Design an enzyme around this catalytic site. Structure first.
Site, PDB file in Angstrom:
ATOM      1  N   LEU A 196       0.831  -1.243   0.000  1.00  0.00           N
ATOM      2  CA  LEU A 196       0.000   0.000   0.000  1.00  0.00           C
ATOM      3  C   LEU A 196       0.828   1.239   0.000  1.00  0.00           C
ATOM      4  O   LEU A 196       2.004   1.169   0.479  1.00  0.00           O
ATOM      5  CB  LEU A 196      -0.974   0.011   1.177  1.00  0.00           C
ATOM      6  CG  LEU A 196      -1.876  -1.230   1.137  1.00  0.00           C
ATOM      7  CD1 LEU A 196      -2.826  -1.041   2.156  1.00  0.00           C
ATOM      8  CD2 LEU A 196      -2.595  -1.437  -0.213  1.00  0.00           C
TER       9      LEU A 196
ATOM     10  N   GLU B 181      -8.413   0.475   9.623  1.00  0.00           N
ATOM     11  CA  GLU B 181      -8.840   0.399   8.220  1.00  0.00           C
ATOM     12  C   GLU B 181      -8.769  -1.042   7.704  1.00  0.00           C
ATOM     13  O   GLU B 181      -9.691  -1.562   7.069  1.00  0.00           O
ATOM     14  CB  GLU B 181      -8.079   1.410   7.346  1.00  0.00           C
ATOM     15  CG  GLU B 181      -8.882   1.968   6.171  1.00  0.00           C
ATOM     16  CD  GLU B 181      -9.142   0.976   5.032  1.00  0.00           C
ATOM     17  OE1 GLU B 181     -10.239   0.902   4.531  1.00  0.00           O
ATOM     18  OE2 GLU B 181      -8.164   0.216   4.679  1.00  0.00           O
TER      19      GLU B 181
HETATM   20  N1  LIG Z   1      -5.512  -0.070  -1.710  1.00  0.00           N
HETATM   21  C1  LIG Z   1      -6.229  -1.165  -1.968  1.00  0.00           C
HETATM   22  O1  LIG Z   1      -7.460  -1.241  -1.695  1.00  0.00           O
HETATM   23  C2  LIG Z   1      -5.673  -2.247  -2.873  1.00  0.00           C
HETATM   24  C3  LIG Z   1      -4.300  -2.218  -3.121  1.00  0.00           C
HETATM   25  N2  LIG Z   1      -3.754  -3.176  -3.968  1.00  0.00           N
HETATM   26  C4  LIG Z   1      -2.316  -3.006  -4.367  1.00  0.00           C
HETATM   27  O2  LIG Z   1      -2.313  -2.975  -5.724  1.00  0.00           O
HETATM   28  C5  LIG Z   1      -1.106  -3.721  -6.225  1.00  0.00           C
HETATM   29  C6  LIG Z   1      -1.591  -5.037  -6.926  1.00  0.00           C
HETATM   30  O3  LIG Z   1      -2.541  -4.717  -7.989  1.00  0.00           O
HETATM   31  P1  LIG Z   1      -2.235  -4.779  -9.491  1.00  0.00           P
HETATM   32  O4  LIG Z   1      -0.782  -4.410  -9.723  1.00  0.00           O
HETATM   33  O5  LIG Z   1      -3.308  -4.058 -10.141  1.00  0.00           O
HETATM   34  O6  LIG Z   1      -2.361  -6.307  -9.771  1.00  0.00           O
HETATM   35  P2  LIG Z   1      -3.470  -7.504  -9.772  1.00  0.00           P
HETATM   36  O7  LIG Z   1      -3.707  -7.878  -8.442  1.00  0.00           O
HETATM   37  O8  LIG Z   1      -4.588  -7.114 -10.563  1.00  0.00           O
HETATM   38  O9  LIG Z   1      -2.623  -8.695 -10.443  1.00  0.00           O
HETATM   39  C7  LIG Z   1      -2.390  -8.649 -11.848  1.00  0.00           C
HETATM   40  C8  LIG Z   1      -2.163 -10.096 -12.338  1.00  0.00           C
HETATM   41  O10 LIG Z   1      -3.402 -10.808 -12.050  1.00  0.00           O
HETATM   42  C9  LIG Z   1      -3.866 -11.570 -13.233  1.00  0.00           C
HETATM   43  N3  LIG Z   1      -5.075 -10.956 -13.655  1.00  0.00           N
HETATM   44  C10 LIG Z   1      -5.616  -9.694 -13.360  1.00  0.00           C
HETATM   45  N4  LIG Z   1      -6.863  -9.623 -13.792  1.00  0.00           N
HETATM   46  C11 LIG Z   1      -7.184 -10.791 -14.398  1.00  0.00           C
HETATM   47  C12 LIG Z   1      -8.274 -11.260 -15.067  1.00  0.00           C
HETATM   48  N5  LIG Z   1      -9.439 -10.513 -15.223  1.00  0.00           N
HETATM   49  N6  LIG Z   1      -8.284 -12.566 -15.484  1.00  0.00           N
HETATM   50  C13 LIG Z   1      -7.199 -13.353 -15.337  1.00  0.00           C
HETATM   51  N7  LIG Z   1      -6.047 -12.925 -14.765  1.00  0.00           N
HETATM   52  C14 LIG Z   1      -6.068 -11.622 -14.250  1.00  0.00           C
HETATM   53  C15 LIG Z   1      -2.683 -11.461 -14.110  1.00  0.00           C
HETATM   54  O11 LIG Z   1      -1.886 -12.536 -13.895  1.00  0.00           O
HETATM   55  P3  LIG Z   1      -1.290 -13.540 -15.056  1.00  0.00           P
HETATM   56  O12 LIG Z   1      -0.172 -12.743 -15.792  1.00  0.00           O
HETATM   57  O13 LIG Z   1      -0.749 -14.659 -14.302  1.00  0.00           O
HETATM   58  O14 LIG Z   1      -2.375 -13.856 -15.999  1.00  0.00           O
HETATM   59  C16 LIG Z   1      -2.135 -10.129 -13.874  1.00  0.00           C
HETATM   60  O15 LIG Z   1      -0.725 -10.025 -14.309  1.00  0.00           O
HETATM   61  C17 LIG Z   1      -0.293  -3.971  -5.037  1.00  0.00           C
HETATM   62  O16 LIG Z   1       0.507  -2.788  -4.732  1.00  0.00           O
HETATM   63  C18 LIG Z   1      -1.330  -4.064  -3.896  1.00  0.00           C
HETATM   64  O17 LIG Z   1      -0.825  -3.748  -2.590  1.00  0.00           O
HETATM   65  C19 LIG Z   1      -4.436  -4.243  -4.468  1.00  0.00           C
HETATM   66  C20 LIG Z   1      -5.819  -4.290  -4.148  1.00  0.00           C
HETATM   67  C21 LIG Z   1      -6.442  -3.275  -3.365  1.00  0.00           C
HETATM   68  C1  LIG Z   2      -6.628  -6.039  -1.289  1.00  0.00           C
HETATM   69  C2  LIG Z   2      -7.264  -4.806  -0.538  1.00  0.00           C
HETATM   70  S1  LIG Z   2      -8.864  -4.328  -0.790  1.00  0.00           S
HETATM   71  C3  LIG Z   2      -8.784  -3.145   0.473  1.00  0.00           C
HETATM   72  N1  LIG Z   2      -9.882  -2.391   0.882  1.00  0.00           N
HETATM   73  C4  LIG Z   2      -9.654  -1.619   1.897  1.00  0.00           C
HETATM   74  N2  LIG Z   2     -10.700  -0.833   2.337  1.00  0.00           N
HETATM   75  N3  LIG Z   2      -8.454  -1.526   2.534  1.00  0.00           N
HETATM   76  C5  LIG Z   2      -7.311  -2.206   2.130  1.00  0.00           C
HETATM   77  O1  LIG Z   2      -6.252  -2.025   2.757  1.00  0.00           O
HETATM   78  C6  LIG Z   2      -7.552  -3.147   1.078  1.00  0.00           C
HETATM   79  C7  LIG Z   2      -6.633  -4.081   0.480  1.00  0.00           C
HETATM   80  S2  LIG Z   2      -4.936  -4.363   0.886  1.00  0.00           S
HETATM   81  C8  LIG Z   2      -5.030  -5.599   2.210  1.00  0.00           C
HETATM   82  C9  LIG Z   2      -3.816  -6.174   2.577  1.00  0.00           C
HETATM   83  C10 LIG Z   2      -3.820  -7.104   3.645  1.00  0.00           C
HETATM   84  C11 LIG Z   2      -5.007  -7.411   4.255  1.00  0.00           C
HETATM   85  C12 LIG Z   2      -5.078  -8.395   5.357  1.00  0.00           C
HETATM   86  O2  LIG Z   2      -3.995  -8.892   5.774  1.00  0.00           O
HETATM   87  N4  LIG Z   2      -6.270  -8.728   5.862  1.00  0.00           N
HETATM   88  C13 LIG Z   2      -6.428  -9.750   6.924  1.00  0.00           C
HETATM   89  C14 LIG Z   2      -6.041  -9.184   8.346  1.00  0.00           C
HETATM   90  C15 LIG Z   2      -6.923  -7.978   8.723  1.00  0.00           C
HETATM   91  C16 LIG Z   2      -6.491  -7.304  10.019  1.00  0.00           C
HETATM   92  O3  LIG Z   2      -5.337  -7.564  10.432  1.00  0.00           O
HETATM   93  O4  LIG Z   2      -7.198  -6.368  10.450  1.00  0.00           O
HETATM   94  C17 LIG Z   2      -7.947 -10.120   6.926  1.00  0.00           C
HETATM   95  O5  LIG Z   2      -8.768  -9.516   6.156  1.00  0.00           O
HETATM   96  O6  LIG Z   2      -8.237 -11.129   7.662  1.00  0.00           O
HETATM   97  C18 LIG Z   2      -6.186  -6.765   3.865  1.00  0.00           C
HETATM   98  C19 LIG Z   2      -6.183  -5.864   2.849  1.00  0.00           C
END
Ligand SMILES: NC(=O)C1=CN([C@@H]2O[C@H](COP(=O)(O)OP(=O)(O)OC[C@H]3O[C@@H](n4cnc5c(N)ncnc54)[C@H](OP(=O)(O)O)[C@@H]3O)[C@@H](O)[C@H]2O)C=CC1
Ligand SMILES: Cc1sc2nc(N)[nH]c(=O)c2c1Sc1ccc(C(=O)N[C@@H](CCC(=O)O)C(=O)O)cc1
Length: 186
Positions: free
Chosen positions: A22, A30
């Site tokens: 993150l 959160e």
């Molecule tokens: N702030 C938050 O709420 C969130 C933060 N994050 C952050 O975002 C980053 C990760 O996200 P991001 O980089 O977008 O990567 P993704 O998690 O989307 O991973 C991408 C890989 O997933 C596969 N993939 C994605 N979509 C599809 C699909 N529709 N069908 C099949 N395969 C799929 C591919 O793998 P392959 O090449 O093997 O096909 C692709 O290379 C990290 O920094 C993480 O910490 C992630 C979620 C939430």
């Molecule tokens: C992949 C996403 S979607 C998202 N949505 C909101 N609102 N906040 C986030 O931070 C994330 C993330 S990134 C993430 C990374 C680790 C974890 C995690 O370790 N979760 C465990 C532990 C939660 C806890 O320690 O409170 C759980 O859901 O059981 C959750 C989210």
């Protein structure tokens, strides 16, 4: 199967990730909100299903994988089987959502939660039908290398209330943030 939902935390500059983690330091309450929303199921004898891309899977600390109390599904076209600790593997979002209709899952799954990353959020946000976005607005800019797609507010209505989601400004580690819920139906 019940509702379809995305959940995300996002900075003011639409950042969600940096270097496989993150953009901001750990916000423990959160994270706890993410856990509560994605785990809590109103339907007796069912669990929720979490759908994530491969990089998102490997960004969760291995000690917390699979996300406990939820069925964990990973999207990848390169993997041959679910990663260690994961339950399911799909090759597309359409495939994952159709799987919930199969006999192995049809009566086990309550809510579906899409937990990112950027590509699956964008595709989900344009999926037909009824969808909610649970968005945490982290109210600072943070250097990021992964971003949330554009929320079309013509279709996604910001809800003026939602049970179980606090409405006031939160603060941890000197970082203010607020919870929002959006809904579309199209
Ligand atoms: N702030 C938050 O709420 C969130 C933060 N994050 C952050 O975002 C980053 C990760 O996200 P991001 O980089 O977008 O990567 P993704 O998690 O989307 O991973 C991408 C890989 O997933 C596969 N993939 C994605 N979509 C599809 C699909 N529709 N069908 C099949 N395969 C799929 C591919 O793998 P392959 O090449 O093997 O096909 C692709 O290379 C990290 O920094 C993480 O910490 C992630 C979620 C939430
Ligand atoms: C992949 C996403 S979607 C998202 N949505 C909101 N609102 N906040 C986030 O931070 C994330 C993330 S990134 C993430 C990374 C680790 C974890 C995690 O370790 N979760 C465990 C532990 C939660 C806890 O320690 O409170 C759980 O859901 O059981 C959750 C989210």
């Amino acid at each position: 199967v019940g509702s379809l939902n995305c959940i995300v935390a996002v900075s003011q500059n639409m950042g969600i990730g940096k270097n496989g983690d993150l953009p901001w330091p750990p916000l423990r309450n959160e994270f706890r909100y993410f856990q509560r929303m994605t785990t809590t199921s109103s339907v007796e004898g069912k669990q929720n299903l979490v759908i994530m891309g491969k990089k998102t899977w490997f960004s969760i600390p291995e000690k917390n994988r699979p996300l406990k109390g939820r069925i964990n599904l990973v999207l990848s076209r390169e993997l041959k089987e679910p990663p260690q600790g994961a339950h399911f593997l799909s090759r597309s979002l359409d495939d994952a959502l159709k799987l919930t209709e199969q006999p192995e899952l049809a009566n086990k799954v309550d809510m579906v939660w899409i937990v990112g990353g950027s590509s699956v959020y964008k595709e989900a946000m344009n999926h037909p039908g009824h969808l909610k976005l649970f968005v945490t607005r982290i109210m600072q800019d943070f250097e990021s290398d992964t971003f949330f797609p554009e929320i079309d507010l013509e279709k996604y209505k910001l809800l003026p209330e939602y049970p179980g989601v606090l409405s006031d400004v939160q603060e941890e580690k000197g970082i203010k943030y607020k919870f929002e819920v959006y809904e579309k139906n199209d």
